[PDB]
Design a protein around this ligand. Structure first.
Ligand SMILES: Nc1ncnc2c1ncn2[C@@H]1O[C@H](COP(=O)(O)OP(=O)(O)O)[C@@H](O)[C@H]1O
Ligand SMILES: Nc1ncnc2c1ncn2[C@@H]1O[C@H](COP(=O)(O)OP(=O)(O)O)[C@@H](O)[C@H]1O
Ligand SMILES: [Ca+2]
Lengths: 184, 388, 165, 273, 174, 341, 128
């Protein structure tokens, strides 16, 4: 089965192993933390990329998550204050974080957000899409590995993304049903 | 545009206000509003600056507490007169540059914006971080990276700034500021000079602090010069509010600013010498930014004005830093570190000067959040102000 | 007709604020106010309205773990209309300190509430039902005060100027 | 502060400091100040040619030619006299004080300097107040564009003088708070029958954001003895109105700040603690 | 920071843990004779105005312990001096004051017994006692030609202003 | 008799066999076990392991084992080894939060309802030495809110958000055997749908089996209580309340139910076996601005002693962080009008 | 983006899918009119048409009522009656023109049917 492994430095996708089909994503742990800092800025919080990295990383690890339907998540942050959570910095001060709890990790699906040139979702699709006798077995045997994969809702997101990609680049109409695959 | 922007630096004891491009503020007034203590137009019955200090029938309030705004109803009116009575500017015709204290929250910036766009209809607004302006003001003596020792009347800050942005996690407050140096000189006088009008105790004190004080290199040698060539003792004379009282001004001349280096003299709970505090702050910052931060230690504040303040501070910081390098070589060859304390003419109002200089440039109108954007995206846009 | 209305509004805010925690059915390890995301049709109750007249009304939308409440405030004329709009906007900006306010109103209304199971958990739901009513009352008052406060100064300001000529 | 002052504080305090040090026999300081006033007024105080013993005050009004077709120069000359000098490039009027040649009472010229802008407007009024005092009727109506999109029309008749302001309220809400103050002006006479008559008209002259205000001045206002004061008020009106409309919203805030506050106390009493 | 004593020699004798330093004095005492023109009572009196404002003093030499003692005693003198009308009147009160029996290390009434070693035996006690009375008189006297101006009856206000200040917040009358 | 453990909700609770200790989740990721010392409560344990909020706790009486399920999608069987409890991971094979769990009377299995629209039946295999589970999916179409085992340890009543109450067969042949016929049916293969209510409104917040299991009752969000008789052809008897929804329910005799919920106080319902009709004869709590013992919604109720045939005491825990002990008899005195059966 | 604009959830198989009166009325026998209208409610029809058509007849009867005659009427209906009524009252609230009298009918039905008569309005899947 296929192994998605995103850590601190880089994120991998490994069919099983076979060097030929493997791929790597230039966006992982640090990249997100970094993007988070940039976001907590336009918010009004000034975190030095060098001095506060460790701190912001704890924030990311505690309040960040993967939005299922971004359009849905963006409306939540814009129209209501349910995403807002308070985080206390080492110096005692308290800051609030909301829409950026999901915007930061979004980069994994939208690299351009952090100016990197397809997104782990589309990368996984392709990796497999390109043996036919082994495709079905892969899709139904995707295992996440890595610290940067512990984002609440990440599996659900992959599945929705892959389903969107399966329906467009493999079909066109609705014949999904049998399109079985669990990213447990 | 044909009209200059408006620049306002709301300090805790003095507000510097004027138009951009001018080298000096058009007004520098006590940060205080006097009020009665509402139906009809009672809200409009108030005064500010000196006018508000001693209004027989009014209570003097100081909205800006510790640099942070404690009262938003008061801070808004102060703006009402700052705009319509002093600057005589139609707020709908000028962009405004307001300063903010370090660590000021995003919510507050939103309150400030709410006031500026909602109450006065300003076309553009920029909330600048005081420390940064202080740095750009130093270009007068370029970069936005360095240590900014700011001291006014309330309290002092040591703010490390790396490329336009403050290193929030590394600031430090020093329990000694103008107000303290005055209270000290006040005691010194109470115990030696007779004839000083009790109700004018502080009055006199503050006068000596600005008129005669300075920073000396060594106390004994100083105490000595006086006890020797008593061409060091000055006389001061004021008026008993109506006979004249005369006093001699002595030790307090160098003992006042002294508490900055030897805090334990006046303050019982603080002892770190400012020279050390700077050392410590820079140390807590990124190893890669320290040397730079050490090369550009800039002063900003009415309490940095004292003569030689930068010379003594720099000297002390070298002794601390060098001695440290000695123990390493000893313990085991680290390249020496260049500790430079920058002082310019624009120091007393360094912040407003920078805001004034910077608000005259074109890139200022490019970073200002406009009214339209305020209306189509909301007050959040004022949470971040592009440094330039 | 005021007390009758506030009585019919109260009782509906009683039936509606019976919430419970609810982990997402759609998304892994997620938890969201169902009335907002509506991603699960069975978990949404029937939207209902309680109107006082053709203008003033309330929309109460309930779900297993969240209630959204939208109030249409009374605006007799132009002056009240803008005072109201400036007052709701004012609070909505502070929605984070208000924790049960929606940053924007449901299209068609002047103000909106988002009460989740977490609120009813750390706040006596009956007291919250009192707030929404206490609220509807106080805004109509404060709007009336502002209204008179404007006129109160319009007079002084018009006399102050003409008396000097 | 209910009425807007007429004197400009910067001109007065700048000049005052200069004159003081001059009289104290001190070495003059170079001076350079750029500032504004209401209705897009731009000022500039400086040392002409770097001559620190000389201080120039200049005012720039985009609508100056207009005031000049109505007695402007002649008035300015009568007021300032020898202080008046050729206008500095980019400005219409320039006052010049010689630090080595001030009067015994520096306070008369200082106060007058501080009123340069008021004195530039004054003539358009003095002119017509004189039409009515002599009976000269049918005279063309003065048209001053004291603002890029706002105008002032002056006319004289057999028994009164009428000034109309075509002002604008950018904010759609300001149009509404405006209508309140305006209505109360229209009724001011229920408290001062000898006062001027004020008329209002919205979006229409006698845009949804344009409003017309009309002040009717009878001889008791435009006569020689009241003339000056009447001018101090009338010419500042437009800024008086907009000033009070804003201050008004500032009051609405302190109210909302107080209300909101209270609400948050009730909500936190809902807490089991 | 605070000013330290530089009279500590490798060959210096210690009465307790204080430094038994030489002093230019005629009064009797275990005080070694001095050749150099500057004695410990000098140093004390030179640095007094700068040291009295200090609250924390780090002890580096046993010499410092002697410096400190003199420094604190000066304060006791000024208490007296302040209230008198002539240089001469002063010299009298100073012999007297330097004669009175102040508390020594180890006794209740002595501040700093946490930094001053107590005399280990009766002999030491008697020696330390006489030294601490010697210093007191060499300082108290020497201190009169400083506090008074060539215009007698004048306790220089530039000396009567430190009467309310206490070095390290310690008093010998405490 | 009320006691507050905390001011925040008590998600769930369970008592040891003797009713000497109680397991509660304080709106936390943990399970604190308390015990009485004289008349005070002492926290004697803390079970830290779930990485979500514990949604259900059940405590096998005899084999003194505690089972918990959480939003972390997990499930742990807790075993006592000396002075500390040891968590054993059980795989439920689900991708949504678990919502409730209950040990079968035979303690050989335990069921977990979840947001995955399925029940996971778990039992241990002493051959591979670990816990395995089988699912019951059809016809469940939504989250399963509540569960209760029939006294035969095969039939399981389940309440969910698709507005239904169902009784399934949770027959595992590798841990028990052919269940004797019941009035609910004869054929009982695994997952067999034995009964499903017909209402289309209100989430079934609670379900309960009678002492002998021939009757099952449930309380819904459409603010109604229901009871079905296996003896009267599964004839369901409804009763609409004039108050807020009930969240928890239980029999206290063959013909009586005790329920509580959003009203914050326990009520009594009786069943007329003959007339086939339910009757409200409730409100046992006869006297923050509330006149009830709990200051918030009562979410759970359990028999403390007396069983479901002749209960003498019962417990209530709710969103006010309080737990209550009720004496069925002390209530019958204080209210000279009360029924019961 | 594109492929994301499609809502795969919509296709997810594990989702959820669910005169006589004028007579008694035009004769003043109000109460009978009420019950008459509360009969066979369009609870199961797809057409809003008929649903709205019914509430109008029902509404037409609540208006034709005399303030004091309300309670009597309310108390003549069995609990399931107060319930269907209560549903209709809320139906009314969505067509102001009346809203003052419905606030009364409401108040009576609330005293008879209880707050749970409302709860049941909120939870009804098949409604008026
Ligand atoms: N719960 C979490 N959610 C999201 N990211 C996390 C979480 N926990 C850790 N991380 C991040 O995952 C990365 C660490 O994963 P790890 O496997 O240790 O990578 P590496 O082996 O390269 O150090 C860091 O970016 C860390 O901040
Ligand atoms: N020449 C001076 N030397 C020392 N202190 C001065 C001097 N001039 C002013 N001060 C002090 O500067 C302080 C005010 O400086 P300022 O920069 O306005 O601080 P803040 O903005 O917080 O009010 C006061 O304590 C004032 O007494
Ligand atoms: Ca300052």
């Amino acid at each position: 089965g296929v192994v998605v492994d995103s850590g601190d430095g880089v994120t991998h996708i490994c069919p099983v192993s076979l060097p030929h089909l493997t791929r790597r994503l230039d966006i992982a742990g640090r990249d997100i933390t970094r993007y988070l800092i940039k976001l907590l800025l336009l918010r009004g919080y000034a975190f030095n990329h060098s001095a506060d990295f460790e701190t912001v990383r704890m924030i990311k690890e505690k309040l960040c998550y993967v939005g299922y339907n971004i359009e849905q998540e963006q409306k939540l942050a814009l129209e209501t204050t349910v995403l807002v959570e308070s985080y206390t910095l080492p110096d005692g001060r308290i800051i609030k974080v909301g829409g950026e709890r999901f915007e930061a990790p979004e980069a994994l699906f939208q690299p351009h957000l952090i100016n990197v040139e397809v997104g782990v979702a589309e990368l996984l699709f392709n990796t497999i899409q390109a043996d036919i006798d082994t495709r079905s077995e892969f899709y139904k045997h995707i295992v996440l590995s890595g610290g940067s994969t512990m984002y609440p809702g990440l599996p659900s997101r992959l599945e929705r993304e892959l389903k969107q990609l399966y329906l467009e680049r493999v079909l066109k109409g609705d014949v999904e049903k049998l399109s079985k695959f669990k990213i447990r | 545009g044909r009209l200059p922007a408006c620049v306002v630096d709301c300090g805790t004891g003095y507000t510097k206000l004027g138009y951009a491009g001018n080298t000096e503020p058009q007004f520098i007034i006590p940060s205080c509003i006097a009020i009665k203590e509402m139906k009809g137009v009672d809200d409009l019955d108030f005064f500010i600056g000196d006018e508000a200090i001693e209004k027989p029938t009014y209570a003097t309030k100081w909205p800006i507490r510790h640099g942070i705004v404690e009262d938003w109803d008061l801070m808004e009116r102060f703006m009402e007169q700052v705009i319509f009575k002093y600057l005589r500017a139609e707020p709908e015709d000028h962009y405004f540059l307001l300063t903010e204290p370090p660590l000021n929250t995003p919510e507050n910036r939103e309150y400030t914006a709410e006031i500026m766009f909602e109450s006065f209809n300003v076309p553009g607004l920029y909330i600048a971080v005081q420390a940064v302006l202080a740095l750009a003001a130093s270009w007068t003596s370029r970069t936005l990276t360095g240590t900014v020792i700011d001291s006014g009347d309330g309290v002092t800050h040591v703010i490390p700034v790396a490329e336009g942005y403050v290193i929030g996690s590394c600031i430090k407050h020093i329990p000694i500021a103008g107000r303290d140096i005055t209270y000290f000189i006040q005691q010194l006088l109470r115990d030696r000079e007779v004839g000083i009008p009790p109700e004018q105790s502080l009055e006199t004190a503050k006068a000596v602090k600005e008129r005669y004080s300075y920073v000396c290199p060594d106390l004994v040698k100083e105490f000595n010069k006086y006890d020797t060539d008593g061409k060091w003792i000055k006389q001061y004379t004021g008026i008993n509010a109506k006979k004249e009282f005369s006093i001699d001004v002595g030790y307090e001349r160098f003992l006042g600013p002294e508490i900055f280096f030897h805090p334990e003299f006046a303050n019982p709970d603080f002892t770190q010498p400012i020279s050390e505090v700077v050392d410590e702050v820079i140390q807590n910052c990124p190893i890669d930014v320290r040397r730079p931060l050490y090369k550009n230690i800039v002063l900003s504040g009415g309490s940095t004005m004292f003569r030689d303040f930068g010379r003594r501070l720099q000297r002390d910081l070298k002794r601390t830093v060098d001695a440290r390098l000695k123990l390493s070589e000893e313990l085991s060859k680290p390249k020496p570190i260049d500790v430079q304390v920058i002082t310019h003419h624009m120091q007393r109002y360094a912040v407003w000067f920078g805001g004034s200089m910077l608000a005259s440039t074109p890139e200022f109108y490019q970073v200002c959040h406009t009214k339209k954007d305020y209306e189509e995206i909301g007050p959040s846009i004022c949470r971040h102000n592009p440094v330039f | 007709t005021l007390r009758p209305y506030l009585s019919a509004v109260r009782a509906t805010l009683q039936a509606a604020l019976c919430l419970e925690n609810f982990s997402s059915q759609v998304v892994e390890r997620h938890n969201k106010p169902e009335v907002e995301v509506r991603s699960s049709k069975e978990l949404l109750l029937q939207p209902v309205t309680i109107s006082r007249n053709e203008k003033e009304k309330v929309l109460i939308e309930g779900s297993i773990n969240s209630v959204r409440v939208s109030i249409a405030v009374k605006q007799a004329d132009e002056i009240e209309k803008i005072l109201c709009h400036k007052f709701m906007r004012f609070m909505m900006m502070r929605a984070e300190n208000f924790f049960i306010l929606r940053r924007k109103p449901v299209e068609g209304y002047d103000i909106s509430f988002l009460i989740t199971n977490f609120h009813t958990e750390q706040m006596y739901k009956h007291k919250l039902v009192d707030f929404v009513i206490h609220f509807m009352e106080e805004i109509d008052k404060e709007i009336s005060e502002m209204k008179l406060s404007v006129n109160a100064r319009a007079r002084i300001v018009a006399e102050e100027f003409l008396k000097n000529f | 502060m209910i009425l807007l002052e007429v004197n400009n504080r910067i001109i007065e305090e700048t000049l005052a400091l200069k004159f003081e040090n001059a009289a104290a026999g001190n070495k003059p300081e170079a001076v350079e100040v750029t500032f504004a006033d209401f209705d897009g007024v731009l000022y500039h105080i400086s040392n002409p040619n770097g001559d620190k013993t000389k201080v120039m005050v200049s005012i720039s009004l985009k609508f100056y030619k207009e005031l000049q077709a109505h007695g402007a120069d002649e008035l300015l000359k009568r007021v300032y006299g020898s202080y008046l000098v050729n206008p500095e490039s980019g400005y219409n009027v320039s006052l010049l004080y010689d630090l080595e040649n001030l009067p015994a009472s520096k306070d008369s010229i200082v106060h007058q300097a501080g009123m340069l802008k008021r004195n530039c407007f004054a003539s358009v009024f003095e002119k017509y107040f004189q039409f009515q005092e002599e009976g000269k009727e049918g005279e063309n109506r003065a048209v001053i564009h004291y603002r890029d999109d706002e105008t002032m029309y002056v006319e004289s008749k057999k028994d009164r003088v009428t000034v109309v302001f075509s002002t604008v309220f950018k904010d759609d809400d300001d149009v509404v708070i405006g209508k309140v103050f305006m209505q109360e002006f229209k009724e001011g006479r229920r408290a001062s029958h000898t006062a001027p008559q004020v008329l209002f008209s919205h979006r229409e002259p006698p845009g949804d954001n344009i409003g017309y205000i009309t002040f009717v001045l009878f001889p008791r206002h435009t006569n020689a003895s009241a003339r000056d004061n009447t001018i101090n008020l009338i010419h500042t009106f437009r800024d008086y109105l907009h000033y009070h409309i804003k201050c008004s919203k500032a009051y609405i805030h302190t109210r909302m700040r107080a209300k909101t506050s209270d609400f948050l106390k009730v909500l936190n009493r809902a807490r089991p603690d | 920071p605070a000013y330290h004593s530089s009279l500590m020699d490798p060959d210096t004798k210690l009465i307790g843990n204080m430094a038994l330093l030489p002093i230019r004095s005629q009064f009797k005492g275990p005080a070694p004779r001095e050749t150099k023109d500057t004695d410990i009572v000098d140093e004390a009196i030179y640095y007094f105005k700068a040291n009295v404002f200090f609250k924390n003093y780090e002890i580096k030499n046993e010499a410092d312990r002697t410096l400190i003692y003199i420094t604190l005693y000066i304060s006791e003198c000024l208490k007296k001096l302040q209230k008198c009308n002539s240089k001469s009147q002063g010299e009298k009160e100073m012999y007297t004051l330097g004669i009175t029996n102040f508390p020594i290390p180890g006794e209740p009434g002595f501040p700093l017994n946490a930094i001053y070693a107590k005399p280990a035996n009766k002999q030491e006690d008697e020696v330390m006692r006489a030294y601490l009375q010697q210093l007191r008189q060499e300082t108290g006297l020497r201190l009169c030609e400083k506090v008074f101006d060539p215009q007698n009856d004048k306790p220089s206000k530039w000396w009567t202003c430190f009467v309310k200040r206490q070095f390290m917040n310690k008093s010998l009358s405490g | 008799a009320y006691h507050s453990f905390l001011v925040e909700p008590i998600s769930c609770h369970a008592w040891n066999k003797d009713r000497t200790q109680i397991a509660i989740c304080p709106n936390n990721h943990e399970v604190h076990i308390y015990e009485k010392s004289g008349n005070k409560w002492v926290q004697v344990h803390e079970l830290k392991e779930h990485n979500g909020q514990v949604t259900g706790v059940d405590w096998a009486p005899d084999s003194n084992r505690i089972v918990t399920c959480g939003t972390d999608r997990n499930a742990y069987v807790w075993t006592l080894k000396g002075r500390t409890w040891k968590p054993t991971l059980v795989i439920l094979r689900i991708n949504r939060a678990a919502r409730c769990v209950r040990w079968a009377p035979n303690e050989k299995k335990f069921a977990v309802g979840s947001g995955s629209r399925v029940i996971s039946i778990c039992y241990f295999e002493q051959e591979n030495d670990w816990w395995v589970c089988k699912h019951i999916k059809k016809p469940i179409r939504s989250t399963v809110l509540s569960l209760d085992w029939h006294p035969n340890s095969v039939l399981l009543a389940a309440g969910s958000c698709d507005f239904k109450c169902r009784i399934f067969s949770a027959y595992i042949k590798e841990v028990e055997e052919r269940p004797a016929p019941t009035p609910w049916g004869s054929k009982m293969p695994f997952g067999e749908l034995m009964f499903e209510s017909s209402s289309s409104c209100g989430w079934v917040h609670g379900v309960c089996f009678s002492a002998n299991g021939s009757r099952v009752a449930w309380v819904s969000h459409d603010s109604t209580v229901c009871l079905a008789d296996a003896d009267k052809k599964m004839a369901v008897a409804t009763l609409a309340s004039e108050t807020l929804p009930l969240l928890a329910v239980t029999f206290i005799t063959e013909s009586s139910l005790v329920a509580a919920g959003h009203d914050c106080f326990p009520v009594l319902f009786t069943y007329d076996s003959a007339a086939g009709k339910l009757s409200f004869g409730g409100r046992l709590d006869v006297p923050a601005g509330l006149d009830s013992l709990h200051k918030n919604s009562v979410s759970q109720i359990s028999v403390l002693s007396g069983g479901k045939a002749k209960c003498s005491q019962f417990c209530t825990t709710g969103m006010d962080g309080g737990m209550s002990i009720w004496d069925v008899r002390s209530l019958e005195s204080a209210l000279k009008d009360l029924k019961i059966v | 983006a594109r492929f994301r604009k499609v809502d795969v959830d919509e296709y997810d198989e594990n989702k959820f899918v669910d005169g006589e009166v004028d007579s008694c009325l035009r004769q003043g026998n109000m109460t009978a009119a009420l019950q008459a209208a509360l009969k066979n409610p369009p609870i199961n029809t797809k057409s809003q048409a008929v649903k709205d058509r019914a509430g109008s007849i029902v509404l037409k009867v609540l208006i034709s009522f005399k303030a004091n005659d309300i309670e009597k009427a309310v108390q003549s209906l069995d609990k399931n009656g107060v319930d269907l009524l209560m549903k209709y009252i809320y139906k009314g609230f969505e067509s102001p023109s009346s809203s003052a009298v419905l606030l009364q009918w409401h108040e009576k039905a609330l005293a008879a049917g209880g707050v749970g008569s409302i709860v049941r309005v909120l939870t009804a899947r098949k409604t008026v």
